[PDB]
Design a protein around this nucleic acid. Structure first.
Lengths: 22, 99, 62, 213, 135
RNA sequence: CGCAAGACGGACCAGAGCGAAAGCAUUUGCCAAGAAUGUUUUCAUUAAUCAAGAACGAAAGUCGGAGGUUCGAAGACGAUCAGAUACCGUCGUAGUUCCGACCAUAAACGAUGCCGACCGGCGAUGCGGCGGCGUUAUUCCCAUGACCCGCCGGGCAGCUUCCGGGAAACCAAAGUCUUUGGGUUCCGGGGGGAGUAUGGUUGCAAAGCUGAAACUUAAAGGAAUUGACGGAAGGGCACCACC
RNA sequence: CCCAUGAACGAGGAAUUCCCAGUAAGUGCGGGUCAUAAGCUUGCGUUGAUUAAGUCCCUGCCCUUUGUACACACCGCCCGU
C-alpha cells in the first residue's frame, strides 16, 4: 500500500474516533 | 541509488525553478529539467517548395522560416525518441549528437 | 507531363517498407549540369536509362 | 439567386506620398443602400503592407499598417497607422547567448499624433571573442535602454508624422541607437520593433490630401 | 462581379490558413481582412471528423477556395498561416502544407508568406492538468 | 476594427545570479537592506555552536473583505471497459488572484548540520580588484566601455586522478578513522505494531509538536553481479518471416 | 473388371501452409506397409515453371543497452476490501 494512502486512512480513522469521543 | 549527479536537471545554486507546460501533454515540468528543442524549419515543406516558388509573384522571395520552441517532459521526450536511454557510462556524455 | 531520360551514375541504396525501391542518382543527358535522386521500382542497373513521368518530383534522400 | 458579390464595388487603396508605390491594392465593399453608406464601411480599414510592396528598395520584414481616413472617387486614401516587424525576423533575431534590450516611449509628434515606439536591440559578440556569451550587466542594459528612449523621443517629438514615417522607412532611429550604444555595449540588431497609433488629432481632410501629394 | 482591371495585372487577397489539429480553415479575405471572398473548411469536404484535419480535406478546400477566388477576379494571395496558438500548440496542423500546395497548384499566384499564430507574452493556465494529458 | 476584465510575464533564460530557507524574471522611480572585492581606516577577543525562546517558512487548507480571465478538487454528463465510482472529452463549485488573520507542514533534497585547519591537477563561469601586446566606440589624447592574455580573492559548478575513504554506488569530500580525541548542536539502535493509542500542548477547524505498550516476527533492508522478464530503446537474422 | 438412372463445380468465407533452378508442380515404379494388398509416408526417376538476389513491416528467434521489488525467474511478485 502507498504510504500516503495509509496516512489518509489513519487520519480518517482519527476523525471517526473524534466523532466517537466528543 | 542515485542515477545522475545532477538529478536529471540543472538546479545548481538555487532552490526553486519556475515550471513550464509540456508542449505534448501539458505536464508541469521544471524549466531546467524539461528537454528543450528549438526547431527552425521552412514554413513550406520540401515538396511544396517547388510549386510555391513557381507560383510566387516575386523573384527570389525566399520563404520565411518557422521558429518553434518545444519543451518536452521526460516521458514525452522519451516516447517521441527525442532522447533515449543510454548505458551507465554513456549517460555522462553531454555533447549533443552531431546531426 | 513530358517524358525524359537520365543516365544512372551511382546506385545509392535499397529502401522500402519490405524493400522494393532502389534509390539512385541520375544525370540528365540534355543538360548534364543537373542531377536528381529517384527511387525506381523493380530490378535496376548501373549506367542504364530510366523513364520518368515527372522531372520536378524527388523521393527522400538518406 | 442571391449573390452578395454582385452588390459589391471595388475601390483602389492609395498610400501616402511617403512611399514610392501608391496603389497598395483593391478593396471591395457592398454598394450603398440607405443609411448603410459604402464610405463608412470602408473608412477605418487597416492594411498591413510590407515595405517591399510599398518601396522599390526596402526590406520586406518591415510592415506598415495604413488606415483609410477618407474615400473619394472609388479611391481610398490611407494614412499611417502603425509599424511592425514580421514574426520570422523577430524570431530569428533572438539568439540564446546574448541579451535583448527592449525599450518603449509614448511620444507625441508636433501635429498631435501620439505614438508608442518600441525599440529592440541585442548585444554583439566581438570578432575575436572567445567567451561563449556576450551578456551586458544590468546597469549597462539600463544605460542602453535610456539611450534608446532618449534617441527615440528626440527623433519623434521634434518632427511631424510625415518626417517620422520618412525616418521609419530606412529605420534611421535604429541605426542612430546602434551608433550611440557602442560606447556602452556593442549592439547587434537594433530596430524600432513596433509603432502603434495611440492617439490621433482631429481629422482634417486638408492634411490628408497634403499627405497624398 | 470582378474588379474593373483585368487579370493580366495581379489583384491581391489574403488567405488566412488556420491549421488546427482538428480541421483546416482556408479563408480568403480582402487585403484589409475585413471583407471575405470565400471561407471553406476541411470539415465541409469530408463526412468524418477523423479526416476533418487530413491533408486531403485541406487540399480540397484550397482547390475550391482558389476556384471561387478566380471566379471573382483574385489572381494572387497573401498567405497568413496560423496554428491554434494561445497556450496550445504553435505548430500548424497536418493540413497547412497541403492547403498551401493545392492553393499554389490551382492556378494561383503566391504573394508574401507570414506566420500569425497567437503567441502570448505569457498566458493563462493551459487546459491540461499539472500532470497533463495521460493518454 | 475596437472596448472591458482578470490572470501571467514567453522567446532572451544558462548545470548563470541573488536570498537563511521557503523563494525570486516587463519598464521606471522611491525605500531600507546585503554579500563579495578594495582598504598601511577603526575597536580590540567583542568569537563558534547552541536547551529555553523567537523571526521566516512552497502548495494545499481555514476564517472575514475584494475580485473573479483562465485552469480546476468535488459534482453533472459523454465516452472506453467484463466492470471504471479512473485514465480521455464537454461543462463546472470550492479553490486558483489580491488584502488582513490563521495553519507551520513537503522527496521543505545535496535525501549530506554549522564553524575551523590541512590535503592533487585542469579548463571554464559570476562578482570585485590588479597587471599587460593588440582590436573596436565615444569623430582625435588619456579615462572608461566591448573584446584578448594572465593573476588574486570569495561564489555556482564541471572534468580528471592509485589523495584517501567506502559494502559498493560513488565522494576532493562522504578524505586527513583500530596510526581511532579541533569545537559544538540535532539525531539513529533488527523489521512490524506505529508516528498508532494515551496524556499534555497549540489551532476556529484540518491538524501540528511531544509520543508508547501489549503483541508479533527471522529477517526486513543497502549496494553491486548473473540470469529471466518488460504493453523499453537500438541493432541482426530467417520463404517452418515478409516483399 | 463391364453395364445405366448420377450431384455443387465462371477463380472457391474471414483467414492461411509449403516454396527459389532441374524448383512449385502433374505421373508412374520398389518398400514400412503385405496373404495380390495404398487414399499415408518414404525413395526413385519422369515432363518441368515468370515474379527473388531484397528488407525488418505483419510473424518469430537472437544480440546490445536499459528497468526490475522477478530468481519456483511475468503462468513471477504483490496491495487492499
Amino acid at each position: 500500500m502507498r504510504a500516503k494512502w495509509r496516512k489518509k486512512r489513519m487520519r480518517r480513522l482519527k476523525r471517526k474516533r473524534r466523532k466517537m469521543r466528543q | 541509488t542515485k542515477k545522475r549527479r545532477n538529478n536529471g536537471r540543472a538546479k545548481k545554486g538555487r532552490g526553486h525553478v519556475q515550471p513550464i507546460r509540456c508542449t505534448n501533454c501539458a505536464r508541469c515540468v521544471p524549466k531546467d529539467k524539461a528537454i528543450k528543442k528549438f526547431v527552425i524549419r521552412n514554413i513550406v515543406e520540401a515538396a511544396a517548395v517547388r510549386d510555391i516558388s513557381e507560383a510566387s509573384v516575386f523573384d527570389a522571395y525566399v520563404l520565411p522560416k518557422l521558429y518553434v520552441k518545444l519543451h518536452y517532459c521526460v516521458s514525452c521526450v522519451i516516447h517521441s525518441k527525442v532522447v533515449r536511454n543510454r548505458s551507465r557510462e554513456a549517460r555522462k556524455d553531454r555533447t549533443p549528437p552531431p546531426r | 507531363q513530358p517524358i525524359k531520360l537520365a543516365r544512372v551514375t551511382k546506385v545509392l541504396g535499397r529502401t522500402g517498407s519490405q524493400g522494393q525501391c532502389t534509390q539512385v542518382r541520375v544525370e540528365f543527358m540534355d543538360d548534364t549540369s543537373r542531377s536528381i535522386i529517384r527511387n525506381v521500382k523493380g530490378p535496376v542497373r548501373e549506367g542504364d536509362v530510366l523513364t520518368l513521368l515527372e522531372s520536378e518530383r524527388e523521393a527522400r534522400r538518406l | 439567386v442571391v449573390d452578395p458579390f454582385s452588390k459589391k464595388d471595388w475601390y483602389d487603396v492609395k498610400a501616402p506620398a511617403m512611399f514610392n508605390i501608391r496603389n497598395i491594392g483593391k478593396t471591395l465593399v457592398t454598394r450603398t443602400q440607405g443609411t448603410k453608406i459604402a464610405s463608412d464601411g470602408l473608412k477605418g480599414r487597416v492594411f498591413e503592407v510590407s515595405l517591399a510592396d510599398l518601396q522599390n528598395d526596402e526590406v520586406a520584414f518591415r510592415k506598415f499598417k495604413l488606415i483609410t481616413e477618407d474615400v473619394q472617387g472609388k479611391n481610398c486614401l490611407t494614412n499611417f497607422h502603425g509599424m511592425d516587424l514580421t514574426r520570422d525576423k523577430m524570431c530569428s533575431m533572438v539568439k540564446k547567448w546574448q541579451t535583448m534590450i527592449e525599450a518603449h516611449v509614448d511620444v507625441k509628434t508636433t501635429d498631435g499624433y501620439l505614438l508608442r515606439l518600441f525599440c529592440v536591440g541585442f548585444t554583439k559578440k566581438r570578432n575575436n571573442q572567445i567567451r561563449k556569451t556576450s551578456y551586458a550587466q544590468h546597469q549597462q542594459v539600463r544605460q542602453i535602454r535610456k539611450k534608446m528612449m532618449e534617441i527615440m523621443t528626440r527623433e519623434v517629438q521634434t518632427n511631424d508624422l510625415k518626417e517620422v514615417v520618412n525616418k521609419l522607412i530606412p529605420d534611421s532611429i535604429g541605426k542612430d541607437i546602434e551608433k550611440a550604444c557602442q560606447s556602452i555595449y556593442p549592439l547587434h540588431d537594433v530596430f524600432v520593433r513596433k509603432v502603434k497609433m495611440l492617439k490621433k488629432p482631429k481629422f482634417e481632410l486638408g492634411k490628408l490630401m497634403e499627405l497624398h501629394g | 462581379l470582378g474588379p474593373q482591371v483585368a487579370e493580366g495585372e495581379n489583384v491581391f487577397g489574403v488567405c488566412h490558413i488556420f491549421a488546427s489539429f482538428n480541421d483546416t480553415f482556408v479563408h480568403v479575405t480582402d487585403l484589409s481582412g475585413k471583407e471575405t471572398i470565400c471561407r471553406v473548411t476541411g470539415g465541409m469536404k469530408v463526412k468524418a471528423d477523423r479526416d476533418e484535419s487530413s491533408p486531403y480535406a485541406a487540399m480540397l478546400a484550397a482547390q475550391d477556395v482558389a476556384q471561387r477566388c478566380k471566379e471573382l477576379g483574385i489572381t494572387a494571395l497573401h498567405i497568413k498561416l496560423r496554428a491554434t496558438g494561445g497556450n496550445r500548440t504553435k505548430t500548424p496542423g497536418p493540413g497547412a502544407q497541403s492547403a498551401l500546395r493545392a492553393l499554389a497548384r490551382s492556378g494561383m499566384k503566391i504573394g508574401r508568406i507570414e506566420d500569425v499564430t497567437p503567441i502570448p507574452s505569457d498566458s493563462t493556465r493551459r487546459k491540461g492538468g499539472r500532470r497533463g494529458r495521460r493518454l
